[PDB]
A paper describes a structure:
Here we report a unique, efficient and effective structure-based strategy to design peptidic modalities based on a single domain antibody. This strategy was used to graft the relatively long and flexible CDR3 loop of the single domain antibody sdAb38 onto dipeptide templates to design mimetics that can potently bind and neutralize [name] viruses. To elucidate the structural basis of binding and neutralization of influenza virus by the PMD-based peptides, crystal structures of the neutralizing (template-based [name] and CP8) and non-neutralizing (non-template based CP14) peptides in complex with H1/PR8 and H5/Viet HAs were determined at 1.59–2.87 Å resolution, respectively. All peptides recognize the hydrophobic surface and embedded cavities at the interface of HA1-HA2 in the HA stem region. This region is highly conserved in HAs across [name] groups 1 and 2 and influenza B viruses, and the target of HA stem broadly neutralizing antibodies (bnAbs), including sdAb3854.
To evaluate the structural basis of the decrease in binding and neutralization activity of [name] against H5 HA versus H1 HA, we compared the crystal structures of [name] bound to H1/PR8 and H5/Viet HAs. The presence of HA1 Val40 in the binding site of H1/PR8 HA allows for better steric accessibility of the peptide macrocycle, whereas the corresponding Gln40 in H5 has a relatively long and flexible side chain. The peptide macrocycle then moves ~1 Å away from binding site surface in H5/Viet HA, potentially contributing towards a 14-fold faster koff rate and corresponding decrease in binding and neutralization activity of [name] against H5. When tested against a broad panel of HAs in SPR, peptide [name] shows heterosubtypic group 1 HA breadth and specificity, but no binding against group 2 or influenza B HAs.
Author numbering:
A (entry chain A), E (entry chain A), G (entry chain A): 8 to 55, 55A, 56 to 83, 83A, 84 to 96, 96A, 97 to 125, 125A, ...
B (entry chain G), H (entry chain G), I (entry chain G): 1 to 19
C (entry chain B), D (entry chain B), F (entry chain B): 1 to 175
The structure:
């Protein structure tokens, strides 16, 4: 009659977790490991305690040039990343162009802190009117204004003497210098603002050899103006010196930027705003708080992040094929 | 609870043999 | 199943064996109960843990996208940049998803073969001292106290000890 | 063969079994003939179909080349563009060819193991009521009408029904 | 004596299909699936009923500027893709340069239909000779000619008054405007054609601020001419306006292009010609008519195509290792 | 081991079998010694050689870096170029390392299954003319000269030749 | 009593080689194959018998322009690759810029041999002083000098007549022509060197239409000089001709380069120097002598090389799991 | 012909069991 | 030595069966 028995078998449980294989989908297993992070907090937070630089409605150009509507960013502290909207409304209040703009923003994505210094004081213009260069395209508190960091110089007593100003970068750090040129509408306005009919702006450093010349043309009125302002920049190295010579149309430097902290940063394109939180990984859609090796939130992240993948599901089978 | 039958750092057997 | 054990000649799993992936259920007349094999289950947990760490480690050199900006007259290189980044993202998504599929299949077959090897181990231990019921069970041609139960669970079963009582009952059943 | 069945202990295939990947050939004295096992063959067709769809689906995010044009003083970025595109093409060609190689190997082993599992299933069914000829065949220790043939083909074979006629002939052969 | 038997076995057949594995090549199987399309019809066909734009011996520049040898493309209908030969023979009949040409062709690869409109009628030049600007480098029916869509303006009665012409894009669509400048051989020809010695061409929109100046130089004669014509373009947005000012060397716009249909298109480099067929997938070597997931014809395709791979063979094993 | 032979029911390897990956050790009273199975070992060397050549051949379309140079105002495209090249290098390093891991695992299992198939081949040859000791050995129920040793090594062993002397000793052991 | 036995078993040996798998690391095997080359000879050698071009302390610009400190490279023979240091010390002795420099080096990476020819002999300047253009920034043997392949032309008897010189490429090969322009410090030096106050340099070929104009500016002194020299180049095709017109600031061509051998080459950035060896594969860190399919030395190689990977170890298992 | 023993949408068993 | 039991072009069995 039936002898003793011993049977060999395997684990089953209440598990409903499903994994996929090449030959079979939706296979229930006793044990799985989800390895895909699908959740974020929907907020722009500090990165490891350092607060980002949220530019709100101002672009990078409006920030560094000093668009009057960007006074919130007159002297920003050290940041962890920069946030800029897709189409900021406060860009070039006076219409024009920003030469080599994208290369400058690339430079930006490796700087963590600027230190603004006055290299050419607006006071020191004795032979020119340094306080008339204002416009209604750049308004501030109901009265015409202009970019705070550059000086729109005007003739003084129907005279525009030949400016020859030099600045020698005596600091220890690289110095981001910005300047500009005016393109008026006609020779009338040209003489009205600068007296001299054919003008120029020579800029020189150890590697820069530039001579701008104003281009006059009738153009469409943007923000009221048909004239244009075209801005240029360079990185003046320590012990090097920049030289400006001009007889008109000069948008002189006043403040420049000392690059005092470098490191890994980014210009993140996001419509969100500061969310008063902290994270170790930030995306333009929200911060991530996860131990998982993967995520599917956004490809552009900063911090100690999971690796991004486009999948909606990524689950490893650890246990057995689970019996019903 | 606070002890397990197995060395399972990643929890690939989640709960099996922990008391 | 590639090895025919899990959901094969062993048709289902044991909800009652709660502290092991593989193991035994004995039924002598001292009683009956479940006992997990912890050497095999711990070997399998080692393998699965190393597999998880292998996948995750191989994925830490994966491509990281970078924001780049271009102006209205740089549409060719902006398009080039976008397709470069999207191509690397598609490549690494393919890598992750496909590695997960393949290693899931191989993990299930790994558990299958572990069960099969356990069964073969005790079958080779017992030999003709037991009838092979064909469902994962062995009917002993002698009587097995709760301690030769552990003797077959720890791999130290003495065939010549019960050789001729098993041969007793084998000759009996043959007539 | 990884599982030793196809082109292993079963040496060749059957041109005469035309409506199945795996199956049986019986020979009792009512007659002899081929019969395909359709549950296993349909399970295998399911697996292979899902594998084909898996490969093709995983390949639909693959890189798509784009025509781009450059002038005489943009040779650096034209070369960059060409090497980007050719690199992604080489990557996806590697992916396709290697996935095909690996999954071909695994498909052949899958069929091998299906045969082996069928053989093991009916061997475990019949036990000592039949001698195992070693070539994929079983010689019945009793007489099997065309309907216990289907009983071993559908997994409902009663060992205790012919237990002692098989033991009859087993005792006979032993002397 | 021999009892009844039952044997377990597997399928074999007449199959000669071979697959490869890591450990073994050329393995015969009972069942395989070829997944690689290797065949095409060798013809350039319509894409889903829409006929392409075959430029034959004319380049993109000769088409849009109106090279007299390109009259077949004076007013092309909506297309599915564009076809251009590797080295078209009808390009710039009058030798010169096409500024930002490749960026313009990139723009093209997303437009399906132009609509040519006359924005500055060749009639309306009362103070200048608008019908003398012809050349033997651009011949048409044995008599000197010029690009049909731009006007080479000449002095009238030893006078070239200062043109100041503006066009305001009143349409709903973007407008591709083209214009150009002449570089003569010497100051002699300069005065002979335009009277004024130092000339210029100012162009202005809401974002464009251009001032071209003719460059005189002795150059090699290409198609008979040592002078050059340099062409420029822009996309004038709706409600925006373009302004031209010039005192010579002006290659004035006559016809511009209204971008009336956008979508996915391509400039395909192919030496074939129209083959009076239809397809759902086109390559520069022929159309593809296939259900297979892969092909090895050409990397550059358009339509609903298989995925391209460089392999000469791609076969999946579905069945068993087939017995001899 | 996926197949339970190497470091499974066969617990260790033979330092004394020096001219073969797999093989036999016989011990009749003419003597005892090692003999390599060269058909199986050569089949395995074929497989492993084709695998090595397969890996190396699939890797000859891999990305080749190119030196490119950029000036101070081309930092965007220089960064793009660097990330393109490093991305392709990371991709192909992943491919190589992962293919090596996977094929190493499959090679070890391939050797395991070769051993298992050899064992099964001679077990199916001998059937009940020998007792299966459970460690890779068979104890002959008759006497096997050094030439039926080669008869079991070359696959030409006649079961009905010693059928009833084996049945002699089987009936003897059963009493 | 114990019958005869036969046992089935497998190979073991003295092997200590270890391989890794997904589920287990450091697995000892009886047989492995290392497939990763980790060794190099630390030398820059010939490539298949052809010696490279080691530029030592001279850059590509100093080589082709003829920086006096680069006389070792006045007439280099056919090379297999070029070697340049990361920051060569002999570059532009007279400070300035090299227009389209990186595109020219890209052209270089496909040329194996130049053949320098004198296209405008320094003798043939009868109306200008062709032997006064020297500087202390470009010294040679304790006396002021200049780039050997271009002529800095000076006024003769307070006269600078309008140069109009043409060279027609009569050779069968493409010809790399180089020339340059001077930017002085002030109008004083401008008249002192060239007499004429407003100068220009027109350059013309079948595709080139250039007119340079000197930019005057006060700049920082580099290697003693605040003036700059800006260099330009072009590839003059066979039967085409180049035309120069200038009234000052012209850095005239003297020697040009006949592109007589093309093929696969590279500009390798390396600090090593010639090591008097031969190899079939070269890296900027040393030559490779290997039969293995992979290496981890450097990504930038030339020759018949293994495929580069970033791994520190790559070993295939060929044999069994080896028993202790 | 117009019937098959198997559900085979992709034809991985091409012709097997179709009559 | 100068002969082997096996065809082993790549030496995947390094030394096994060579005398
Ligand atoms: C797997 O399950 C999901 C829902 O959980 C379902 O959407 C999907 O279609 C299933 N896959 C298959 C192959 O049935
Ligand atoms: C163009 O005309 C429209 C009238 O429909 C007007 O609104 C717009 O301001 C004009 N643009 C310019 C630049 O004059
Ligand atoms: C999220 O971060 C907070 C702050 O460090 C932490 O308390 C919390 O545990 C994290 N989330 C999870 C799920 O651990
Ligand atoms: C496989 O067959 C093709 C011809 O059908 C032949 O060219 C190729 O060399 C064969 N491969 C091998 C490894 O023999
Ligand atoms: C250059 O000289 C050749 C004579 O060999 C002539 O055919 C060609 O037209 C000349 N080119 C120019 C631009 O004068
Ligand atoms: C090719 O397309 C035509 C038109 O739709 C169709 O009739 C034909 O069946 C297609 N080719 C194949 C092989 O099906
Ligand atoms: C494998 O061995 C190396 C030293 O040979 C050691 O550094 C490494 O940590 C080992 N790996 C594991 C998983 O123990
Ligand atoms: C700038 O000033 C420093 C003094 O600290 C001097 O060494 C350097 O030469 C100056 N640079 C120029 C261009 O004058
Ligand atoms: C290195 O190259 C030399 C010269 O051809 C050769 O003699 C030597 O054998 C090579 N190294 C090895 C390890 O074979």
């Amino acid at each position: 009659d039936p002898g003793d028995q011993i049977c060999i078998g395997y684990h089953a449980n209440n598990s409903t977790e499903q994994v996929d294989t090449i030959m079979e989908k939706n296979v229930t297993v006793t044990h799985a490991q989800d390895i895909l992070e699908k959740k974020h907090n929907g907020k722009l937070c500090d990165l490891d305690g350092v607060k980002p630089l949220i530019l709100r409605d101002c672009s990078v150009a409006g920030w560094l040039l000093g668009n009057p509507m960007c006074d919130e960013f007159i002297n920003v502290p050290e940041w962890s990343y920069i946030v800029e909207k897709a189409n900021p409304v406060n860009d070039l209040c006076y219409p024009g162009d920003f030469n080599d703009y994208e290369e400058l923003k690339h430079l930006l994505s490796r700087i963590n802190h600027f230190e603004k210094i006055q290299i050419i004081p607006k006071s020191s213009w004795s032979s020119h009117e340094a306080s008339l260069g204002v416009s209604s395209a750049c308004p501030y508190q109901g009265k015409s204004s202009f970019f705070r960091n550059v000086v729109w110089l005007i003739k003084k007593n129907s005279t525009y003497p030949t400016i020859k100003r030099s600045y020698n970068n005596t600091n220890q750090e690289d110095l981001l210098v910005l300047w500009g040129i005016h393109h008026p509408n006609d020779a009338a306005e040209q003489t009205k603002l600068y007296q001299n009919p054919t003008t120029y702006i020579s800029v020189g450093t150890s590697t820069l050899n530039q001579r701008l010349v104003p281009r006059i043309a009738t153009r469409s009125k943007v923000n009221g103006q048909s004239g244009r302002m075209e801005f240029f920049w360079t990185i003046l190295k320590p012990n090097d010196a920049i030289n400006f010579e001009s007889n008109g149309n000069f948008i002189a430097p006043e403040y420049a930027y000392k690059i005092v902290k470098k490191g890994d940063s980014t210009i993140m394109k996001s419509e969100l705003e500061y969310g008063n939180c902290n994270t170790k990984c930030q995306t333009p859609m929200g911060a991530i708080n996860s131990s998982m090796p993967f995520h599917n939130i956004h490809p552009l992240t900063i911090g100690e992040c999971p690796k991004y993948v486009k999948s909606n599901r990524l689950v490893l089978a650890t246990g057995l094929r689970n019996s019903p | 609870x606070p002890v397990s039958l197995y060395e399972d750092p990643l929890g690939v057997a989640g709960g099996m043999g922990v008391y | 199943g590639l090895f025919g054990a899990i959901a094969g000649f062993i048709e289902g799993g044991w909800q009652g064996m709660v502290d092991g992936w593989y193991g035994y259920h004995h039924s002598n007349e001292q009683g009956s109960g479940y006992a997990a094999d912890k050497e095999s289950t711990q070997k399998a947990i080692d393998g699965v843990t190393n597999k998880v760490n292998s996948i995750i480690d191989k994925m830490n050199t994966q491509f990281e996208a970078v924001g780049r900006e271009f102006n209205n007259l740089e549409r060719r290189i902006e398009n080039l940049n976008k397709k470069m980044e999207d191509g690397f993202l598609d490549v690494w998504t393919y890598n992750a998803e496909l590695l997960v599929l393949m290693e899931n299949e191989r993990t299930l077959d790994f558990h299958d073969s572990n069960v099969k090897n356990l069964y073969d181990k005790v079958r080779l231990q017992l030999r003709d001292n037991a009838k092979e019921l064909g469902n994962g069970c062995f009917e002993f041609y002698h009587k097995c106290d709760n301690e030769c139960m552990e003797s077959v669970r720890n791999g130290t079963y003495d065939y010549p000890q019960y050789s001729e009582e098993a041969r007793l009952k084998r000759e009996e059943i043959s007539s």
